[PDB]
Each structure stands twice: as structure tokens, then as C-alpha cells.
């Protein structure tokens, strides 16, 4: 029941700018770094979906719930949801789906899509569920 | 007549790492700066490419450089690119880092930087072209 974000850091990149871009939407708890040549790979993890509260908030402040529901629904596979957001956009405080990789381990994935990406009527959320248990 | 290097600096990149990348092969005399920054570095003397000149010989890639440099000639300019990440780690690999050289006799630049070779050895060793 954890979330994991993976992102690369090339030699011209500043590991702290990548982590800071991710912090905009993810309050990670753990971090290990791995390599694939001259490229570092960040694997960030958190145990609770609460770690995605800032993600929940941005989808609303940006008014892109419509778009987020399709990307998230499409990203469901089994008991996991996987999606990607634009890295540079993220670096400037903007969330845009498409890189920063997100992986969510949860039994009822659908409850996650509805929690942060509800259907909308004229931009207004048709419902506002609490963070899934 | 000048040497100019242009490189992008994305929000996730460190301008210092990109400047260091270029520093491995070029010594700028001045620099200028959507959500992406464009770094423009330039020099007025060809001595600014002495590091480049040294690396092609040390790593013994003269043949490869001549090919890329010669084809890079258009009119009185020479245009070519090198790999950003490779350059960030000190490696010179020809293609995001763009080189633009203005000079009235471009082939001289090429023969200075990348002499034709026979059996892996430079057939000539010209001095840096004037200016």
C-alpha cells in the first residue's frame, strides 16, 4: 500500500532540482539512488496515500480533473496505477501528464482515481471523497 | 569572426554543469542568457578552441572530427554539435551543445583542429589560424 516515484538525473541535471520538482506533488519518505551508466535513477517511496495530498490539490487548482481522470484510469493495470508527468513542467510547479514516473500499490485502484480525479460538471467536482484508507 | 556556443538549460538542469561541460573544450570571453534558458557563449579568438584541439589529439579522433567539421562548413561559417551529457562528463562526442564558428577561410580551422591522418598520425601540424 505504498507509492513510488522514479526519475532520472543526467550529468547536466541537478539532483536537487529533480527532487524539488517532485516535492511539489509528492511528499516522499524514503530515497535510494541507482545507476545506469552516467545516469542516476531516483527511487522515492512513501507508505501512505497522504503522500499524494499535494497531487490531489494541484489537480484542482489547475482545473484539469477531466484530463487527470482519463490518464489515471488508463494507467490502472491490476492492483496498481502507473502514470507519468512532465519533468520540466513539474520543475516550474506545473503538473502535466504524459519524465517523472508514478507507481501506486493499492487493492482498489478505482478508489484512487475517484479520490483525486472526480467527474466534473462545468469544472465543479461532482463528489469529494476522503483519502482512501 | 568569432566562436559561439549555444546550449539549453532546462529547469531541471544546473547552468553550472552545462558551463562546466562546455569549459572542457571552449573558453568563452563573455556569455548571455518558454521555461527553458538558452546559454550563448562566445569568443573572438580561435585560441578559445585550444582545449578542443588538445582533446581531438589526446583521444585520437582526428579522422572523425575532420569528417564532421568539414561537412559542417556552409559558407564562411562552420556548424556542428556535440553530445551534452557526454560533454558534461568530459567526453567529446559529435552529433544539444551547438558550435558556430565564423571565419573567412573555414577549411583552415578544419586543417588546424583535425589534420588528415596517415596510420593514425597527423600529416601536418598547423598553428592556430590568425585572429
Can you give the residue ranges of every domain in chain B? 1-123
Q: B26 near B49, Cβ under 8 Å?
A: yes
- Range B1-123 classified under CATH 3.30.1440.10: yes
B47-to-A2, A20, B2, B68, B129 alpha-carbon distances in Å:
56, 40, 11, 20, 9
Burial class (CB in 10 A: 0-12, 13-18, 19+), B88: buried
Q: Residue B28: which of B53, B11, B6 has the closest Cα?
A: B6
Nearest-CA neighbor of B75 among B97, B103, B115, B48? B103
Angle made by CA atoms B26, B12, A12, in degrees to the nearest 5: 30
Reported structure resolution in angstroms: 2.4
Report the alpha-carbon distance of residue A25 to residue A95 in Å, rounded. Answer: 8
- The widest CA-to-CA distance across chain B, in whole angstroms, is 49
CA-wise closest residue to A69 among A117, A115, A128: A117
Question: A102-130 as b/e, with b when 16 or more CB fall inside 10 Å?
Answer: bbbebeebeebbbbbbbeeeeeeeeeeee
Closest CA to A17 of A91, A87, A89: A91
Q: Which of B31, B28, B24, B2 is nearest to B84 (CA)?
A: B24
B84 touches A: beta carbon within 8 Å: yes
Rg of chain B (C-alpha set):
14
Alpha-carbon distance B123 to A100, whole Å?
50
Kind and range of the H or E element at B88?
helix B84-88
- CATH fold group of domain A1-126: 50s Ribosomal Protein L5; Chain: A, (3.30.1440)
Residue B69: CB atoms within 10 A of its CB come to 24
Q: Quick one: DSSP state of residue B46?
A: G
The technique by which this structure was obtained is X-ray
Q: A11 contacts in B (CB within 8 Å)?
A: 17, 21, 85, 88-89
Question: How far from the centroid of its chain's Cα atoms is residue A33's Cα?
Answer: 19
Q: Per-residue DSSP letters for A47-105?
A: SSGGGGHHHHHHHHHTT-HHHHHHHHHHTB-SSEEEEEE-HHHHHTT---B--EEEEEE
Q: Do B13 and A12 touch (CB under 8 A)?
A: yes
| Chain B interface includes A101 (CB < 8 A) | no
Contacts of A14 in chain B (CB under 8 A): 12-14, 17
- Which helix (H) or strand (E) segment is B31 a member of? strand B30-32
Amino acid at each position: 500500500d505504498k507509492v513510488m516515484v522514479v526519475a532520472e538525473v543526467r550529468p547536466s541535471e541537478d539532483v536537487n532540482k529533480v527532487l524539488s520538482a517532485i516535492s511539489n506533488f509528492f511528499d516522499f519518505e524514503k530515497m535510494n539512488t541507482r545507476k545506469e551508466g552516467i545516469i542516476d535513477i531516483l527511487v522515492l517511496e512513501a507508505r501512505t496515500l497522504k503522500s499524494l495530498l499535494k497531487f490531489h490539490r494541484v489537480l484542482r487548482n489547475e482545473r484539469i480533473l477531466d484530463s487527470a481522470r482519463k490518464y489515471l484510469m488508463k494507467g490502472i493495470e491490476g492492483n496498481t496505477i502507473a502514470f507519468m508527468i512532465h519533468k520540466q513542467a513539474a520543475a516550474v510547479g506545473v503538473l502535466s501528464f504524459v519524465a517523472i514516473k508514478f507507481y501506486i500499490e493499492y487493492q482498489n485502484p478505482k478508489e484512487i482515481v475517484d479520490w483525486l480525479a472526480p467527474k466534473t460538471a462545468h469544472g465543479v467536482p461532482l463528489w469529494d471523497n476522503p483519502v482512501p484508507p
